UniProtKB/Swiss-Prot annotation, chain A:
Family: Belongs to the Ycf2 family.
Protein name: Protein Ycf2
Functional note: Probable ATPase of unknown function. Its presence in a non-photosynthetic plant (Epifagus virginiana) and experiments in tobacco indicate that it has an essential function which is probably not related to photosynthesis.
Positions spanned in the full protein: 2243 to 2294 of 2294
Location in the cell: Plastid, Chloroplast stroma
Top-rank taxon, per record: Eukaryota
Taxonomic classification: Eukaryota, Viridiplantae, Streptophyta, Embryophyta, Tracheophyta
Amino acid sequence: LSNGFFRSNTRSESYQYLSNLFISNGTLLDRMTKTLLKKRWLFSDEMKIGFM
Amino acid sequence: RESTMPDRFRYLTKEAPDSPIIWP
């Protein structure tokens, strides 16, 4: 299995890009987690409202 | 009473009254 070290590094770069994108927009997920803890149920219209 | 129901839909589980007929 010479094809096991290739997928791992691809997922590593995917994780790095996801981390770099999530770090800058951390306030969005922070307020959104506060909202989810506040009101138990949650939809996509609330996504688009709370993207600010 | 604890329930797994969202807060937005709470008004949709009650039967609203209707205006009675008046033309007779």
